[PDB]
């Protein structure tokens, strides 16, 4: 990826499925393109604002599409909370959904970003101009594929997939 | 309405005329409800609105009907909270009460929900709300 930079923040998720370790997902955030959206995600990984992704789950997984999580308030897709509020605006749509392993903001329409996010499992151009892409999986796509295997077409998960540890490297 | 491949057609003037006839002639009769059901086979929310809006007068009755529709729409939202996207390929966003009532949804969305596999029969759901409202109006006389 040619958008990558050494000065961009790097964060991680350690993921477990019903207690069984799945490994670490390491992500670079495009602060060079979307600093506000990147800063939200970074802060939620560290939990420095008093809340974050620690012990949140992947509540929705659709194979060959997305692994979705980050609902830190309701843990089912109905909630979420950013460092800027329970809603903040779409920063830009510069980076497109060109392939797997991209980080993109979940939302309920225009300017409804909070903490919910997606890791893409495939190119998803139909999300372009609608969801803000703000990073990519630098390492541990094997962990993302393990998460994918517990999903279903309608999004239901057959295991409790918890972010047991997270932070910034 | 949707007719079966499932394809969309605009509402027929004959359907509208038949509805206007039963509303005008046999106003506040119990048999308005079965006639409403008979004339709304495969109807979209758009079609149902077109039927209801074609009637001139009876605006106090329409206001009561509107109030019933708003209650059922709010009840739908109470029981069906919104889940965050993104929408997967070949799938639909979740309809809100106002989408079922044909207020905030597009025709294409209405068609999309009704013809999806599995479907969300927004036309039928809205029909139940309307029939509930029609029953209230008939009940008080």
């Amino acid at each position: 990826m040619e958008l990558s930079k050494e000065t961009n923040p790097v964060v991680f998720f350690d993921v477990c499925a019903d207690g069984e370790p799945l490994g670490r997902i390491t992500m670079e955030l495009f602060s060079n393109i979307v600093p506000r959206t990147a800063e939200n995600f970074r802060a939620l990984c560290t939990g420095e604002k008093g809340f974050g992704f620690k012990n949140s789950i992947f509540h929705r997984v659709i194979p060959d599409f997305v692994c979705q999580g980050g609902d830190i308030t309701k843990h089912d897709g109905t909630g979420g909370q950013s460092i800027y509020g329970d809603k903040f605006e779409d920063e830009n749509f510069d980076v497109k959904h060109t392939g797997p392993g991209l980080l993109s903001m979940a939302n309920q329409g225009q300017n409804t970003n909070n903490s919910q996010f997606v890791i893409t499992l495939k190119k998803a151009e139909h999300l372009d101009f609608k969801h803000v892409v703000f990073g990519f999986v630098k390492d541990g796509m094997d962990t993302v594929k393990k998460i994918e295997s517990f999903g279903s077409p309608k999004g239901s998960v057959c295991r409790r997939i918890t972010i047991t540890e997270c932070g910034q490297i | 309405p949707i007719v079966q491949q499932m394809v969309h057609q605009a509402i027929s003037p004959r359907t509208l005329n038949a509805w206007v006839k039963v509303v005008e002639e046999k106003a506040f009769s119990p048999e308005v409800i079965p006639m409403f059901s008979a004339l709304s086979e495969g109807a979209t929310p758009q079609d149902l609105n077109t039927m209801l809006n074609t009637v001139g007068g009876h605006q106090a009755a329409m206001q009561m009907l509107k109030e019933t529709i708003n209650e059922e729409a709010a009840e739908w939202d109470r029981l069906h909270p919104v889940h965050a996207g993104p929408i997967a390929p070949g799938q639909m966003r979740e309809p809100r009460g106002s989408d079922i009532a044909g207020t905030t949804s597009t025709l294409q969305e209405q068609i999309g929900w009704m013809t999806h596999n599995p479907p969300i029969p927004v036309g039928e759901i809205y029909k139940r709300w309307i029939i509930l409202g029609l029953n209230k109006i008939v009940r008080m006389y």
Side-chain angles (χ1 to χ4, degrees):
Chain A
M1 204 98 300
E2 36 64 40
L3 296 92
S4 180
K5 283 183 181 286
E6 296 171 39
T7 48
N8 276 335
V10 182
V11 293
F12 71 90
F13 294 147
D14 290 326
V15 191
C16 288
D18 301 315
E20 187 189 328
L22 301 181
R24 176 166 292 187
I25 303 168
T26 303
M27 297 152 286
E28 189 189 328
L29 310 175
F30 298 131
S31 290
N32 59 318
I33 307 297
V34 281
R36 196 162 182 257
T37 310
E39 170 59 18
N40 179 52
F41 198 86
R42 188 202 66 78
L44 291 167
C45 290
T46 64
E48 65 196 61
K49 308 300 191 178
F51 54 94
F53 293 127
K54 179 79 182 202
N55 304 136
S56 64
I57 64 166
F58 285 80
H59 67 274
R60 186 202 183 199
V61 183
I62 300 168
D64 210 29
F65 178 51
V66 299
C67 304
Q68 177 165 344
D71 186 349
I72 65 174
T73 59
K74 300 295 180 67
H75 314 277
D76 67 355
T78 64
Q81 187 190 324
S82 79
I83 65 171
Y84 313 116
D86 70 325
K87 292 185 180 177
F88 74 95
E89 69 176 40
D90 297 307
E91 189 167 10
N92 63 62
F93 303 106
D94 293 8
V95 184
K96 305 300 185 288
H97 298 81
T98 53
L102 292 172
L103 284 167
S104 183
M105 292 298 287
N107 65 50
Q108 298 176 16
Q110 53 149 196
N111 304 334
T112 55
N113 297 292
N114 47 52
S115 48
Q116 291 197 51
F117 66 90
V118 140
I119 298 171
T120 61
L121 299 161
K122 187 176 180 178
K123 182 171 179 284
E125 75 301 319
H126 72 281
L127 308 187
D128 297 336
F129 313 110
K130 294 177 185 180
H131 299 264
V132 176
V133 177
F134 63 93
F136 75 103
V137 178
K138 187 184 181 178
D139 194 9
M141 271 296 293
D142 294 351
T143 305
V144 178
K145 299 296 289 187
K146 288 170 185 176
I147 293 164
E148 184 181 24
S149 67
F150 308 128
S152 56
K154 297 289 180 289
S156 299
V157 301
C158 64
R159 288 203 179 185
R160 191 170 197 281
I161 306 162
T162 303
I163 297 171
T164 51
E165 183 62 284
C166 57
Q168 185 178 2
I169 299 170
Chain B
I2 305 299
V3 300
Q4 287 172 312
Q5 284 184 330
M6 292 170 287
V7 297
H8 177 266
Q9 292 172 353
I11 194 164
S12 186
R14 294 160 201 178
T15 302
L16 294 172
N17 290 347
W19 173 243
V20 170
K21 195 98 296 186
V22 71
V23 171
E24 284 182 348
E25 296 181 8
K26 309 194 183 69
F28 305 93
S29 178
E31 75 197 77
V32 173
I33 292 160
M35 186 57 62
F36 183 76
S37 299
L39 295 169
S40 62
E41 194 172 60
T44 64
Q46 187 188 56
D47 295 325
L48 299 170
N49 287 136
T50 309
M51 290 173 71
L52 294 170
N53 294 329
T54 303
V55 177
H58 299 272
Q59 297 303 132
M62 290 306 78
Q63 187 59 40
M64 275 188 66
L65 181 53
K66 189 179 173 187
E67 285 164 6
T68 298
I69 289 160
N70 293 337
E71 288 163 17
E72 299 307 312
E75 183 67 6
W76 175 270
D77 292 345
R78 191 179 71 77
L79 300 170
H80 300 93
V82 181
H83 294 68
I87 304 158
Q91 301 290 75
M92 301 288 296
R93 71 186 181 79
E94 296 162 299
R96 295 180 180 90
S98 60
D99 295 319
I100 292 160
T103 302
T104 51
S105 59
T106 65
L107 175 54
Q108 195 171 67
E109 286 175 331
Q110 291 170 29
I111 292 164
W113 287 310
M114 291 174 67
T115 60
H116 193 260
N117 178 221
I120 299 174
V122 296
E124 297 300 320
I125 297 160
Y126 188 30
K127 199 182 296 182
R128 290 193 303 97
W129 302 351
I130 292 161
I131 290 165
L132 192 72
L134 291 163
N135 273 305
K136 284 192 197 177
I137 294 162
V138 172
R139 182 67 170 182
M140 57 164 47
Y141 300 112

